[PDB]
Amino acid sequence: QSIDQLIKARGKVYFGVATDQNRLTTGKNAAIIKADFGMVWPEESMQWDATEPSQGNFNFAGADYLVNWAQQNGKLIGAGCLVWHNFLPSWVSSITDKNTLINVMKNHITTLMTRYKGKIRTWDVVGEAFNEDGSLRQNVFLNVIGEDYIPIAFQTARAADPNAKLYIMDYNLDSASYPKTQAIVNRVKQWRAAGVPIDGIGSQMHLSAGQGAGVLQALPLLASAGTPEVSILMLDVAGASPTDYVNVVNACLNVQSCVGITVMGVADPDSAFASSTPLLFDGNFNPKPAYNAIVQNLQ
């Protein structure tokens, strides 16, 4: 049974998965995504190095493949990350001055979002903006633009595609008692009061065994920032315990504003963390106990 169909039958928007052209042309990925998932996200093909390897020179080969595949196959699309330190070319982090970096950042946001305007559900506009203590991460954007980079990024994104949900995302937001979780909430509330159009907080849930339980209170904390939505993305769990995965699903179900859950991949051997068998399908692309437990929890 399809966990996407089942979660939609509980009133959520999707059960999604990260993928890309390289996965869709091989193995059983495409067949499983077609059958069991309702939203796809590009793992890497929309990241900065892939789409803008030098200033103003864009390419969309991978991104177009994924967006077109989704459309061809009736799947929702989320995309990102527009502004974060990962996949960031040195040409960008070598920028030393505020206005240059603002204009580079705006042009990157605008170009990517405009290309797919109206067809993308969610854009991860800003990612991994926080340190573990809740201060803002000293990536090149914070270092050079200052804290206004987050307001600017979101306002630019809203202009580029007003139909898209605009998210901030971070990891280690998995306990309500962790300073990072508290800080993103406080800062998002503030930013929204300042008119920054942050529609969602996305919790990048790369979890170790036993961490699912903490999400039951972390997720409503994230939802208390007042964004219209929250979501779970990049979900995987070391060991793929049914208990961890069911806890995450229940947190989603318990949080009105939580629209859905995206897993970081389909089958364990293709995970960057393959040896931790942290996904819902095994190396033979068969559903794992955790997949069945999610089915049972959503029936």
Backbone as a ProteinNet text record, in pm:
[ID]
protein_1_A
[PRIMARY]
QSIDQLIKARGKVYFGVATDQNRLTTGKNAAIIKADFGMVWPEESMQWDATEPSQGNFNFAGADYLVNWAQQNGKLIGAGCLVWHNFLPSWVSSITDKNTLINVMKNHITTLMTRYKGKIRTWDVVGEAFNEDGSLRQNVFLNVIGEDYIPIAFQTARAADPNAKLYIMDYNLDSASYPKTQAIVNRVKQWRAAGVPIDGIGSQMHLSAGQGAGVLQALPLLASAGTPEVSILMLDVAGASPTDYVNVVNACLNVQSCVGITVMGVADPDSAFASSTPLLFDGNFNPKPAYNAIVQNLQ
[TERTIARY]
81.7	0	85.1	30.5	106.3	95.2	209.3	208.1	165.9	194	142.3	-10	-70	-215.7	-272.5	-210.1	-264.7	-255.9	-145	-131.5	-225.2	-246.2	-344	-482.5	-511.8	-639.8	-652.3	-543.9	-553	-557.2	-554.1	-571.1	-441.8	-329.2	-202.7	-185	-84.1	-64.1	15.3	115.5	201.6	288.4	334.2	452.9	549.9	664.1	754.4	888	969.9	1104.1	1197.5	1321	1425.4	1482.2	1509.1	1557.5	1628.2	1661.5	1719.2	1725.6	1763.1	1772.7	1856.6	1970.4	2056.9	1987.7	1892.4	1819.4	1705.3	1643.7	1524.4	1554	1676.4	1715.8	1767.9	1767.6	1831.2	1750.3	1775.9	1710.9	1560.8	1494.9	1350.6	1301.4	1386.4	1346.1	1219	1216.1	1103.4	975.1	980.2	858.7	804.9	894.6	852.8	800.1	867.8	821.7	684.7	663.9	534.5	428.5	459.1	356.7	328.7	433.6	424.9	446.5	488.5	521.9	444.5	419.3	341.8	410.8	535.6	611.1	756	827.2	970.5	1046	1170.9	1257.2	1389.2	1457.5	1591.9	1692.4	1763.9	1866.2	1973.4	2021.9	2134.9	2118.9	2026.9	2022	1974.9	1916.3	1879	1972.6	2077.7	2171.7	2256.1	2325.2	2384.6	2493	2578	2685.6	2633.3	2522	2464.2	2397	2338	2257.3	2327.8	2429.3	2497	2644.5	2716.6	2858.6	2953.6	2913.9	2981.1	2871.9	2908.5	2809.9	2727.4	2595.8	2503.3	2495.8	2566.9	2568.3	2494	2371	2284.6	2273.3	2239.6	2207.6	2110.7	2023	1912.5	1893.9	2000.2	1978.7	1914	1974.7	1921.4	1790.1	1783	1661.6	1543.1	1563	1458.1	1417.7	1512.9	1473.2	1377.5	1410.8	1329.5	1193	1189.5	1062.1	975.7	1036.1	958	913.6	996.6	954.7	835.4	841.9	733.4	604.5	611	490.9	440	531.3	491.3	425.3	463.9	415.9	321.4	268.6	164.9	209.6	333.8	391.9	410.6	387.8	424.8	576.4	622.1	764.2	797.3	901.6	964.6	1105.8	1163.8	1297.5	1376.2	1507.2	1595.1	1733.8	1826.6	1806.9	1867.2	1798.5	1844.7	1962.2	1962.5	2060.5	2105.7	2221.7	2285.3	2430.9	2506.2	2651.1	2689.8	2604.2	2638	2618.8	2699.4	2694.8	2719.9	2783.7	2797	2930.5	2931.6	3059.4	3147.5	3278.8	3373.6	3355.4	3307.8	3288.6	3190.6	3094.6	3001.5	3062.4	3122	3177.7	3302.6	3360.2	3472.2	3426.5	3295.6	3244.3	3256.3	3308.7	3345	3252.7	3162.2	3084.8	2935.1	2861.9	2719.5	2638.9	2653.4	2563.6	2590	2715.8	2743.2	2679.1	2692.7	2637.5	2485	2425.3	2280.2	2237	2306.3	2256	2276.7	2388.6	2413.5	2308.2	2278.2	2180.8	2042.3	2004.8	1873.8	1864.1	1965.5	1959.1	1951	2021.6	2014.1	1872.5	1815.1	1677.8	1581.5	1590.5	1491.3	1498	1619.2	1632.2	1576.1	1613.4	1566.9	1414.4	1359.4	1218.5	1136.3	1185.4	1107.1	1098.2	1205.6	1204.2	1089.7	1053.8	953.8	830.3	809.8	707.2	570.3	500.6	370.1	366.4	478.2	475.1	538.7	595.9	668.8	586.3	558.5	484.6	564	687.9	766.2	906	959.5	1101.1	1162.6	1273.2	1359.5	1447.1	1413.2	1478.9	1607.5	1604.6	1720.5	1733.5	1855.8	1883	1998.2	1988.9	2098.3	2156.4	2068.6	2106.3	2149.3	2131.2	2155.2	2271.9	2345.4	2438.2	2362.7	2430.1	2366	2325.6	2391.7	2354.3	2241.4	2190.5	2083.9	2126.6	2255.7	2301.3	2295.9	2307	2305.3	2439.5	2433.3	2551.7	2625	2756.8	2846	2884.1	2783.7	2808.6	2836.9	2870.7	2911.3	2800.2	2676.5	2565.4	2558	2566.4	2563.4	2688.1	2804.2	2931	2930.9	2879	2897.5	2773.7	2656.3	2535.3	2490.4	2508.6	2447.6	2312.9	2245.6	2121.8	2013.3	2023	1922.3	1920.6	2018.2	2011.4	1885.4	1830.6	1716	1590.4	1564.8	1456.3	1464.2	1582.9	1598.4	1569.3	1623.3	1603.3	1456.4	1384.6	1242.9	1160.2	1187	1110.4	1137.3	1261	1292.4	1218	1215.6	1151.4	1002.6	941.6	798.8	766.9	852.1	828.7	849.3	943.6	975.6	863.9	803.9	693.2	600.1	500.5	412.7	328.5	323	244	317.6	448.6	525.3	521.3	519.3	544.3	693.7	730	869.2	912.3	1009.4	1052.3	1193	1212.9	1345.6	1357.8	1475.1	1492.6	1620.1	1620.8	1740.8	1729.5	1844	1856.7	1882	1869.4	1882.6	1780.1	1661.7	1546.1	1455	1513	1440.2	1404.7	1441.5	1402.6	1359.4	1247.1	1198.7	1292.1	1379	1468.5	1602.3	1621.7	1749.8	1747.5	1855.7	1857.6	1831.6	1875.1	1857	1709.8	1632.5	1490.1	1420.6	1458.6	1397.2	1432.5	1556.6	1605.1	1540.2	1524.7	1463.9	1320	1251.3	1115.5	1115	1201.5	1201.2	1235.9	1334.4	1377.2	1270.3	1206.5	1100.6	983.5	944	835.6	870.6	992.5	1041.6	1040.1	1099.2	1107	969.7	875.3	740.7	678.4	705.2	651.6	714.3	833.3	901.4	858.9	766.1	717.4	798.2	883.8	953.4	854.9	833.8	730.5	778.4	798.9	836.1	710.3	678.1	558.6	575.8	696.7	716.3	850.2	855.4	978.5	984	1094.4	1120.2	1224	1190.8	1282	1349.2	1479.4	1561.4	1597.5	1524.3	1523.7	1611.4	1740.3	1838.8	1862.3	1790.3	1784.3	1866.2	1914.8	1974.8	1865.9	1895.2	1796	1746.6	1614	1552.8	1520.9	1558.5	1529.9	1389.4	1313.3	1179.3	1092.7	1106	1016.9	1026.2	1145.7	1163.5	1088.5	1062.5	995.9	852.8	794.8	657	638.9	738.2	728.6	806.7	906.5	981.9	895.9	815.9	737.9	633.3	556.8	465.6	539.5	659.1	736.3	764.7	809.2	837.4	712.4	597.5	472.8	424	482.3	438.6	500.4	586.8	643.5	540.5	426.9	320.3	330.7	422.6	417.4	292.4	242.4	127.5	151.3	274.3	305.5	434.3	445.3	574.1	580.1	701.8	712.1	834.2	839.2	954.5	1020.6	1152.6	1218	1347.6	1402.9	1530.7	1525	1411	1394.5	1465.8	1547.3	1597.7	1627.8	1633.5	1653.8	1748.2	1858.2	1955.2	1886.9	1895.1	1832.4	1692.2	1629.7	1491.8	1394	1405	1312.9	1170.5	1076.4	936.9	897.5	952.3	909.7	951.4	1074.5	1118.7	1032.7	1011.9	936.3	791.6	730.2	592.3	579.8	677.2	680.1	684.3	766.7	775.2	643.1	580.7	452.3	345.9	344.9	248.9	270.5	394.9	418	353.2	377.3	310.9	159.3	100.4	-44.8	-95.4	-17.7	-59	-48.5	24.9	53	-27.6	-130.8	-225.4	-153.6	-54.4	10	118.3	140.9	245.7	187.2	231.6	172.6	216.7	330.6	375.2	517.2	564.9	691	762.8	890.9	971.5	1088	1110.4	1224.4	1341.5	1460.6	1579.4	1611.2	1556	1572.2	1475	1486.3	1399	1460.2	1573.6	1624.6	1758.6	1779.2	1895.3	2026.9	2056.8	2192.5	2223.4	2121.6	2141.8	2145.8	2121.5	2139.8	2288.1	2319.4	2453.4	2488.6	2389.6	2407.1	2363.4	2390.8	2339.6	2363.6	2479.1	2510.2	2426.1	2362.9	2272	2131.6	2111.7	1985.3	1874.3	1874.9	1791.9	1666.6	1636.2	1525.2	1414.9	1314.4	1193.7	1190.2	1280	1294.1	1434.2	1449.2	1579.9	1647.4	1766.5	1844.8	1780.5	1686.9	1610.3	1489.1	1481.3	1369.1	1237.6	1243.7	1122.9	1090.5	961.8	928.1	978.5	1034.6	1087.4	980.8	1009.4	917.6	869.6	959	915.1	812.5	829.2	729.5	595.3	595.5	470.9	409.5	493.5	444.2	380.4	435.1	373	240.9	236.4	108.9	6.2	44.6	-49.6	-92.9	-3.5	-33.3	-122.5	-126.3	-204.9	-333.1	-348.2	-475.7	-570.9
-121.8	0	126.8	233.9	355.4	443.7	477.6	564.4	705.1	748.4	875.8	875.2	774.6	771.8	764.5	684.6	670.9	801.1	872.9	996.8	1102.9	1104	1193.9	1160.5	1032.3	992.2	1024.7	1066.1	1125.3	1277	1336.5	1478.9	1556.5	1487.6	1553.6	1572	1650.3	1680.9	1573.7	1512.9	1420.9	1339.9	1228.7	1157.2	1158.2	1225.4	1257.3	1187.8	1207.6	1149.5	1235.9	1244	1308.6	1213.1	1266.9	1185.5	1277.6	1226.2	1308.4	1219.4	1279.9	1206.6	1079.2	1087.6	970.4	853.6	878.7	770.2	720.2	809.6	774.1	690.9	699.3	618.5	480.9	445.6	321.5	251.2	120.6	43	52.3	33.8	39.4	169.7	272.5	396	451.6	468.6	537.1	461.3	327.8	248.4	264.8	263.6	279.3	420	522.5	659.1	677.3	623.8	631.2	567.5	450.5	376.7	435.7	477.1	497.2	638.9	732.4	867.1	968	1083	1182	1312.8	1324.2	1447.7	1407.4	1475.8	1453.2	1583.5	1572	1685.4	1649.7	1745	1716.9	1715.3	1603.6	1594.5	1697.4	1704.9	1791.6	1879.6	1847.7	1912.8	2058.5	2103.4	2243.3	2321.3	2258.4	2325.4	2425.4	2513.2	2627.3	2583.4	2489.5	2454.5	2396.3	2321.5	2256.6	2354.8	2460.6	2547.6	2675.1	2717.5	2844	2828.8	2754.2	2724.2	2843.1	2947.4	3077.1	3183.1	3307.3	3413.6	3434.8	3424.9	3451.4	3346.1	3235.2	3130.2	3015.2	2994.9	2896.5	2776.2	2665.8	2543.9	2466.1	2397.7	2330.1	2189.1	2124.9	1994.8	1896.7	1878.7	1786.1	1833.3	1961.9	2015	1999.1	2036.4	2017.6	1871	1779.2	1640	1604.7	1644.9	1606.3	1674.6	1804.5	1875.9	1817.7	1788.2	1730.3	1589.1	1512.2	1378.9	1384.7	1474.7	1487.6	1519.8	1617.4	1654.7	1538.6	1471.4	1360.7	1253.1	1240.2	1131.5	1173.5	1294.7	1336.2	1357.8	1397.3	1417.3	1565.7	1602.3	1734.3	1748.4	1872.2	1903.2	1998.5	1968.9	2066.4	2083.3	2199.1	2224.9	2310.1	2304.6	2380	2322.5	2375.8	2487.2	2608.9	2719.8	2836.7	2906.2	2913.3	2992.5	2907.4	2845.6	2777.3	2756.2	2703.5	2687.7	2560.7	2463	2341.1	2358.1	2285.9	2295.1	2436.5	2520.7	2661.9	2679.9	2727.3	2747.1	2848.9	2826.8	2923	3061.2	3069.7	3202.2	3283.5	3217.1	3288.6	3316.6	3215.4	3241.5	3328.8	3349.3	3441.4	3585.9	3612.3	3748.6	3812.1	3935	4001.4	4116.6	4158.5	4279	4254.3	4330.7	4307.8	4320.1	4430.8	4452.1	4352.1	4316.4	4218.6	4086.5	4047.3	3918.9	3922.9	4035.2	4048	4028.1	4091.8	4086.1	3947.9	3885.2	3749.5	3655.5	3671.4	3585.7	3606.9	3733	3759.2	3698.6	3718.3	3669.1	3517.3	3452	3305.9	3259.5	3322.4	3291.7	3315.2	3433	3473.5	3385.9	3357.2	3278.3	3139	3073.4	2937.8	2933.8	3023.7	3014.7	3055.6	3150.9	3195	3084.8	3007.3	2904.3	2807.3	2778.8	2678.9	2742	2870.7	2946.4	2880.7	2862.1	2802.8	2652.7	2584	2437.8	2371.6	2450.8	2401.1	2428.7	2325.7	2349.8	2432.3	2391.5	2439.8	2465.8	2580.4	2608.9	2623.2	2552.4	2575.6	2692.9	2808.4	2932.7	2949.2	2926.4	2937.9	2805.9	2754	2629.3	2641.8	2565.2	2548.4	2684.6	2778.2	2913.6	2924.2	2819.6	2824.5	2737.6	2788.6	2703.4	2623.2	2521.7	2435.9	2510.1	2620.6	2699.1	2797.1	2801.6	2893.3	3026.7	3058.1	3174.3	3143.2	3248.5	3230.9	3182.9	3086.5	3029.9	3134	3139.2	3228.6	3169.3	3153.3	3128.5	3262.3	3256.2	3379.6	3481.9	3435.2	3528.6	3609.4	3541.9	3614.1	3700.3	3645.4	3716.2	3847.5	3845.2	3954.8	4043.5	3983.1	4062.2	4101.2	4011.9	4029.8	3962.4	3983.1	3908.9	3943.4	4058.5	4094.3	3999.2	3909.5	3817.3	3732.7	3704	3613.4	3689.6	3808.2	3891	3909.2	3941.9	3966.3	3840.1	3726.3	3603.4	3569.7	3578.4	3544.6	3643	3773	3868.6	3850.1	3815.9	3790.1	3668	3563.7	3438.9	3460.6	3536.7	3561.8	3633.5	3728.5	3797.1	3703.8	3610.7	3528.2	3428.6	3372.4	3278.8	3287.5	3373.9	3392.4	3270.8	3169.1	3048.6	2950.2	2962	2863.4	2888.9	2782.3	2792.4	2810.9	2909.4	2946.3	2901.3	2812.8	2750.8	2792.2	2795.1	2785.8	2642.9	2584.1	2447.1	2437.8	2344.2	2314.3	2174.7	2124.3	1994.1	2012.4	1899.2	1896.8	1985.2	1985.5	2050.1	1946.8	1841.2	1718.3	1703.6	1800.5	1804.8	1944.6	1954.1	2084.9	2148.9	2072.1	2127.2	2169.7	2156.1	2192	2339.7	2413	2556	2586.6	2501.1	2531.2	2534.4	2439.2	2432.4	2556.2	2596.8	2712.7	2838	2847	2967.6	2987.2	2880.1	2900.3	2947	2896.5	2940.7	3088.4	3129.3	3269.4	3360.6	3321.5	3405.1	3408.3	3295.3	3295.2	3379.5	3369	3454.2	3600.4	3639.6	3776	3815.8	3731.5	3760.2	3778.3	3691.6	3707.1	3837.3	3876.8	4003.9	4120.1	4100.3	4198.7	4191.1	4103.8	4093.4	4002.9	3919	3822.8	3711.6	3679.6	3579.2	3435.6	3394.1	3256.5	3173.7	3093.4	3011.8	2884.2	2836.6	2706.7	2695.3	2608.2	2555.6	2408.9	2371.4	2235.1	2174	2063.9	1999.4	1884.9	1898.9	1801.6	1691.4	1581.7	1482.6	1364.8	1387.9	1281.1	1227.7	1122.3	1083.1	959.3	954.5	833.4	753.3	625.7	536.7	591.6	590.2	637.8	785.4	861.3	1003.7	1037.7	942.2	973.7	1028.4	973.5	1013.5	1162.3	1220.7	1360.1	1451.5	1404.1	1484.7	1510.9	1425.4	1449.5	1585	1633.2	1766.4	1871.5	1831.1	1927.9	1984	1897.9	1944.4	2047.7	2030.3	2139.1	2263.2	2251.2	2371	2446.1	2374	2440.9	2506.2	2440.8	2494.5	2614.8	2642.5	2755.2	2887.1	2884.7	3006.4	3082.7	3021.1	3086.2	3079.2	3002.2	2982.5	2905	2927.9	2850	2702.4	2659.6	2518.8	2485.7	2358	2297.2	2167.9	2114.5	1985.4	1913.1	1784.9	1698.3	1668	1688.7	1654.3	1584.9	1525.2	1457.1	1353.6	1290.2	1196.4	1066	1022.6	886.4	858.5	730.6	690.3	572.4	586.9	478.7	359.2	246.6	124.4	107.2	216.4	215.2	142.6	168.7	109.4	150.6	55.5	95.8	197.3	186.9	277.2	420.7	439.7	574.3	631.2	553.5	606.2	634.9	548.9	571.9	694.8	716.6	838.6	962	960.6	1075.4	1097.3	988.1	997.5	1052.4	1003.7	1052.3	1199.6	1245.7	1387.1	1466.9	1424.8	1485.6	1488.3	1371.9	1362.5	1452.1	1471.7	1547.6	1698.4	1743.6	1884.3	1926.2	2006.6	2048.1	2104.8	2189.9	2264.9	2185.2	2060.6	1979.9	1913.3	1957.3	1916	1781.3	1732.1	1605.1	1576.9	1465.9	1406.4	1368.2	1403.5	1359.6	1280.3	1159.4	1077.9	1109.8	1085.6	1127.9	1042.8	922.2	836.8	720.6	633.8	517.7	398.1	349.1	219.5	238.1	156.3	169.1	175.8	91.1	94.6	225.5	302	432.7	549	524.8	627.4	656.9	784.9	820.5	751.3	705	635.5	490.2	428.9	295.2	188.2	190.4	83	92.4	207.6	221.8	182.2	132.3	89.4	177.6	306.4	403.2	443.5	380.6	414.1	311.1	324.4	243.7	123.5	117.2	4.4	-49.5	-180.2	-241.1	-247.7	-308.7	-316.7	-395.5	-483.1	-545.1	-463.2	-339.9	-248.2	-306	-388.9	-436.4	-351.7	-335.4	-251.2	-316.4	-235.2	-279.5	-280.4	-343.8	-334.3	-193.7	-95.5	40.3	89.2	52.8	90.5	31.4	-98.1	-163.9	-103.2	-62.1	-1.1	134.1	208.7	334.8	307.4	207.5	169	140.9	58.9	16.5	134.8	231.1	348.6	447	442.8	536.6	474.8	343.6	277.5	304.9
0	0	0	-54.1	-76.2	46.6	106.5	223.3	187.3	64.7	19.3	13.2	-49.9	-54.9	86.3	172.7	305.7	383.5	373	449.8	395.4	264.1	205.8	257.1	276.6	333.5	481.7	548.4	680.1	673.6	557.1	545.3	533.1	517.5	492.4	343.3	306.7	165.6	90.8	155	81.3	173.6	117.9	163.8	46.8	64.4	-43.4	-28.1	-131.8	-131.4	-212.3	-165.7	-242.9	-345	-462.2	-572.5	-671.7	-789.3	-894.6	-1016.4	-1127.5	-1253	-1240.2	-1171.8	-1160.2	-1092.9	-1004.6	-939.2	-1025	-1101.1	-1175.4	-1297.1	-1351.6	-1465.8	-1424.7	-1294.5	-1252.1	-1144	-1130.5	-1028	-1041.4	-927.9	-921.2	-861.6	-856.2	-790.1	-850.3	-982.7	-1045.5	-1019.3	-1025.6	-1004.4	-862.6	-765.5	-626.8	-600.2	-653.2	-632.8	-694.5	-814.3	-879.1	-790.8	-734.3	-662.3	-524.7	-451.2	-308.1	-257.3	-340.1	-296	-379.1	-320.2	-391.3	-421.2	-380.9	-397.2	-412.9	-500.8	-517	-496.1	-451.8	-428.6	-494.4	-556.2	-610.6	-497	-484.5	-382.5	-406.6	-530.6	-562	-684.4	-772.9	-903.5	-898.9	-788.3	-773.1	-682.8	-630.8	-544	-623.6	-552	-620.6	-717.5	-676.3	-766.5	-894.2	-888.9	-1006.8	-1101.1	-1047.9	-1129.1	-1166.6	-1092.6	-1120.5	-1087	-1170.3	-1142.9	-1159.3	-1231	-1234.6	-1240.3	-1202.6	-1188	-1314.5	-1300.5	-1408.3	-1515.6	-1501.2	-1601.1	-1536.9	-1581.1	-1520.1	-1610	-1547.1	-1616.6	-1530.4	-1599.3	-1536.2	-1584.2	-1633.8	-1695.1	-1598.8	-1481	-1383.1	-1327.4	-1295.1	-1234.3	-1329.6	-1455.5	-1554.1	-1562.3	-1561.8	-1567.3	-1455.1	-1334.7	-1221	-1224.6	-1256.3	-1261.7	-1371.4	-1486	-1592.8	-1560.4	-1490.3	-1453.5	-1359.1	-1262.9	-1167.4	-1239.7	-1330.1	-1403.9	-1487.5	-1556.1	-1640.1	-1556	-1428.1	-1345.2	-1232.9	-1239.4	-1148.9	-1006.4	-986.8	-855.1	-823.9	-698.6	-648.8	-647.1	-641.4	-643.7	-530.6	-455.8	-368.7	-419.3	-394.9	-446.9	-348.6	-361.9	-275.6	-289.9	-213	-122	-183.9	-182.5	-257.3	-189.6	-56.5	17.6	136.5	124.9	236.5	198.7	295	277.5	203	194.9	125.7	-22.7	-100.2	-245.1	-297.2	-218.6	-249.5	-320.7	-444	-513.5	-444.3	-455.6	-400.9	-460.6	-584.5	-642.2	-560.8	-495	-408.8	-272.3	-207.7	-75.6	-81	-199.5	-215.5	-227.1	-213.8	-226.4	-89.1	-84.9	39.3	75.8	-13.5	8.2	-3.4	77	99.7	-28.6	-101.4	-213.8	-322.8	-342.5	-446.4	-409.7	-282.8	-243.4	-243.7	-201.7	-212.8	-356.6	-450.7	-586.8	-646	-611.2	-655.1	-597.7	-469.5	-402.8	-462	-484.8	-541.1	-679.4	-761.6	-898.4	-898.3	-806.5	-797.8	-760.3	-658	-616	-730.8	-790.6	-888.9	-1010.2	-1055.7	-1177.9	-1159.6	-1050.5	-1029.9	-1012.5	-928.9	-899	-1018.4	-1096.6	-1211.1	-1316	-1332.2	-1433.3	-1414.1	-1289.4	-1258.4	-1195.3	-1221.9	-1151.6	-1168.6	-1056.6	-1053.7	-1045.4	-1059.4	-1060.8	-941.4	-852.2	-737.4	-613.6	-537	-413.8	-313.9	-287.3	-175	-226.4	-187.4	-202.1	-65.3	-44.9	69	32.6	86.8	50.2	129	259.3	345.9	417.4	423.5	491.8	589.1	697	793.6	836.3	869.4	907	1052.3	1132.5	1276.2	1319.3	1416.6	1489.5	1594	1648.7	1747	1873.7	1906.4	2022.2	1993.6	1870.6	1839.5	1784	1785.3	1711.8	1563	1482.2	1339.2	1287.7	1199.3	1139.9	1056.5	1080.3	1006.8	871.2	786.7	646.1	575.9	447.8	380.2	376.3	372.1	371	500.3	613.9	739.8	755.1	717.4	736.4	658.3	536.1	441	428.9	421	416.9	556.6	654.2	783.9	791.1	903.4	927.8	828.1	760.8	661.4	542.6	529.5	416.6	418.1	534.9	547.1	503.5	555.9	500.6	349.2	300.3	158.1	78.4	121.7	46.1	33.4	144.4	143.4	61.7	72.7	-5.6	-153	-189	-328.7	-379.8	-300.1	-337.9	-356.5	-266.1	-279.9	-410.4	-450	-575.3	-694.6	-683.8	-799	-827.6	-722.9	-741.7	-623.3	-631.1	-516.7	-484.3	-569.9	-543.8	-454	-443	-370.8	-221.5	-144.8	-2.5	16.7	98.7	119.5	257.1	261.3	385.1	426.6	556.5	615.6	664.2	656	703.5	786.2	878.7	954.6	1010.9	1054	1118.3	1266.2	1335.7	1482	1549.7	1492.5	1551.5	1616.6	1671.7	1704.2	1851.2	1934.1	2074.3	2111.7	2183.2	2224.9	2327.5	2388.8	2488.9	2430.4	2300.6	2241.2	2204.1	2233.4	2201.9	2056.2	1964	1822.8	1786.8	1839.1	1811.6	1865.2	1983.9	2044.5	1967.5	1923.4	1858.2	1722	1644.7	1513.2	1529.4	1632	1660.7	1696.2	1789.3	1830.1	1713.5	1634.3	1523.1	1414.2	1383.4	1283.7	1328.8	1454.9	1500.3	1477	1518.5	1500.8	1354.5	1269.3	1126.6	1067.9	1105.6	1052.6	1099	1224.5	1271.8	1198.3	1145.6	1064.1	918.9	881.2	745.9	656.7	710.9	625.2	591	463.4	424.7	437.8	561.4	590.7	609	507.4	511.8	590.7	604.6	665.7	732.3	832.6	886.9	848.8	786.8	748.7	839.9	902.7	994.7	920.1	899.8	827.6	926	920.6	1028.2	992.6	1003.8	986.4	1127.4	1165.2	1303.7	1334.8	1457.5	1510.7	1581	1606	1666.1	1799.8	1816.6	1937.5	1938.5	1836.3	1838.6	1792.1	1738.4	1692.1	1802.8	1923.3	2031.2	2059.9	2047.7	2080.1	1985.1	1863.6	1764.2	1803.6	1886.1	1927.1	1994.6	2068.5	2126.7	2050.6	1973.3	1895.2	1783.2	1716.8	1601.5	1640.7	1747.6	1785.3	1832.3	1890	1917.8	1787.1	1683.4	1556.6	1501.1	1516.4	1464.9	1543.5	1658	1738.7	1694.6	1593.6	1538.1	1458.2	1426.5	1354.9	1204.3	1150.4	1007.3	968.5	848.2	803.7	802.8	776.3	764.4	836.7	871.6	899.9	821	804.5	738.1	789.2	757	784.2	652.3	645.8	521.9	549.8	446.4	461.3	570.9	586.4	696.6	665.6	759	762.8	908.2	941.3	1080.2	1080.9	1151	1162.6	1224.4	1156.7	1198.3	1146.3	1102.5	1051.4	1144.6	1274.7	1370.5	1334	1327.1	1314.6	1420.9	1541.7	1647.4	1619.2	1571.2	1536.8	1426.9	1320.4	1206.9	1243	1323.6	1365	1453.7	1542.7	1623	1535.5	1430.9	1342	1271.7	1226.2	1158	1251.7	1374.9	1471.5	1500.3	1509.2	1531.6	1420.2	1295.8	1181.2	1199.1	1229.5	1246	1357.5	1462.5	1579.3	1556.8	1456.5	1434.6	1312.8	1339.7	1238	1118.4	1142.6	1036.1	964.6	1002.8	940.3	817	699.1	572.4	524.5	566.9	514.1	553.3	499.6	539.1	410.7	397.4	285.1	340.4	285.1	319.8	230	282.1	210.2	88.1	77.4	-39.7	-37.4	-138.6	-148.7	-79.6	-131.1	-89.2	-20	81.8	168.7	94.8	-5.4	-64	-129.2	-166.8	-228.3	-130.8	-3.6	96.7	113.7	136.3	181.5	311.4	385.4	511.9	497.9	381	346.9	452.8	517.3	609.6	734.8	759.1	872	835.2	715.8	656.4	708.6	671.9	742.5	668.6	559.2	470.9	481.8	398.7	412.7	318.5	221.6	130.8	146.9	134.5	145.7	9.6	8.6	-113.6	-225.5	-193.7	-302	-338.4	-285.1	-307.8	-257.5	-150.1	-88.3	33.7	65.8	180.6	307.3	391.5	519.1	628.3	741	855.7	888.5	884.4	912.3	809.2	680.9	581.4	618.6	651.9	688.1	814.2	908.8	1030.8	1002.7	907.1	868.3	800.5	710.6	648.9	756.1	854.2	957.9	1042.2	1062.7	1143.3	1071.2	940.4	861.4	811.5	821.4	791	905.2
[MASK]
+++++++++++++++++++++++++++++++++++++++++++++++++++++++++++++++++++++++++++++++++++++++++++++++++++++++++++++++++++++++++++++++++++++++++++++++++++++++++++++++++++++++++++++++++++++++++++++++++++++++++++++++++++++++++++++++++++++++++++++++++++++++++++++++++++++++++++++++++++++++++++++++++++++++++++

